Each structure stands twice: as C-alpha cells, then as structure tokens.
Design a binder for this molecule. Sequence first.
Ligand code: ZN
Length: 252
Amino acid sequence: PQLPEVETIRRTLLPLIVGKTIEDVRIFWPNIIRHPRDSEAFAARMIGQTVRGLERRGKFLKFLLDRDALISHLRMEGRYAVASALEPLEPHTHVVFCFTDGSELRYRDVRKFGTMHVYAKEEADRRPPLAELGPEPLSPAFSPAVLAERAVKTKRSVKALLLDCTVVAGFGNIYVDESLFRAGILPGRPAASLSSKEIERLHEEMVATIGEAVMHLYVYGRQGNPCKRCGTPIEKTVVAGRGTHYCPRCQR
DNA sequence: GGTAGATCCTGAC
DNA sequence: CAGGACTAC
Ligand SMILES: [Zn+2]
C-alpha cells in the first residue's frame, strides 16, 4: 500500500483496536521483528499494554500503547485485519496480536518484506526507522525551498531524489512517476539541472497528486500505450533501480 | 559524508 | 527479477 492507502488504514484500523489490551503476541516469521532483535522480547514487552492511538508518518504506522510504540511498515503487500481468535488464520499470517476480548490484530504479508520495531514511545522518533524521515509531503515542512535545497546539493537524478525517504516521507514509485509526468520533467534528469520554475512546478504536482489520492494514471504501468495528453507511446526504463514510466514528448 | 550496492521473499513471466 | 528502506566504496 502507498501513503494514501496507509492513511486510510490508520483511519479505519484505529476504532477497531483502540482501548484493547494485549494478552499475547504470536510470531510465525521472526525476521519481521527488527527491534528488539529477539522476537521473544518483542512479544513479552507488549503483553499487558493497551492500544491508545494510531498515527502515520510517511508509509509507517505508529501504534501507540501505554509505554511503547509499535512502528510498522507494510512494504508492497502487507495487510492488517481485526478478527476473532476463534476463526482460522488467513494464509501468510506472520504476526498476531491477541487482545483480552478474544479479538486479534493480524498482520499478513505474502512477500514477508514488512518490518516491525518497538521502542518506548519517547524514543520512537529518534530511532530507526523513523529517525531521519523527511517531512510529510502534505505539510508546510515540505516546501519548494526544501526541495530546491536537496536538489542543488546532489548529483543524483530527480527520480532518485524523490524516492529518498530523507527528502520527503513515503513518496512511492507510482506517485514519483505520475508527479514527474504532470510536471513535465524527465525522471532521468539530474536533480541539480532543474530550474527554480521546474522545482516549483514539481512540488505543486507532488502535492496535488498525493493530495488527490488521499481524497486514473498517466504513465505508471501504461508502457506501450498512448499518452493521455499527446498520444505518444508511454515508455518504460530503469532509473534508480526502479521501473520508470514516462512520456518522451510531454516530459523534458 | 554522499552514493551505489546488497538485503530480504516469492508470485509471476 | 521488481519492490522500500545497513554496509562499504
Ligand atoms: Zn505525452
């Protein structure tokens, strides 16, 4: 799920778990647990704590408990569900939080790429994976000025820049490609080659694209098909190790 | 210190 | 072989 989807998850999941107390934590793929490194310590510390809140930073979910915070990233295909402990688990369920009311918060992930970190709440923001996270794309903290500053000081492509979580929080591949198309900028352009006008336009489109989503595609996954603006076949290449889609006429 | 590379997994082609 | 986010040149 991307940022907009994660925000939806945060909004919808909260009322389903708030006020519930953890009685057990069951882990079927320990590698998901990143801190404490020992999955048994992870499980033990959470028992007895009540869920008090749920926040989002970038694509990370932050579960607020009594003492600790649980920081969770779903990556490509991670999913949470709340269901009865009496029913069989769905396939690919790797972590389950059991509540005293007989309900469960279940984490599924066919790819097993998701991660979980638990720290005392006051530490969470100064530890991985939240430390160094850039500003929210929809916040004043993410401005053309901030974007321009990062762009001038790097030799990387503009796409590589936008994918950098330290530059802006949780801007996914799909939104990078879409934003770059809407701003009329080639993904392979050196970040430092962008004019002040192009930086301004890009920031504008980044906010509009992600902002619309939290509330059709031009290029992403449309390779070989006609551009919706000019009819030129959309092309796909690799930039910054990622599938990269663009229109060679609309983008320069 | 900045930046590329290795890292994980597995359904899919 | 793509996908998001610690090690070593
Ligand atoms: Zn076009």
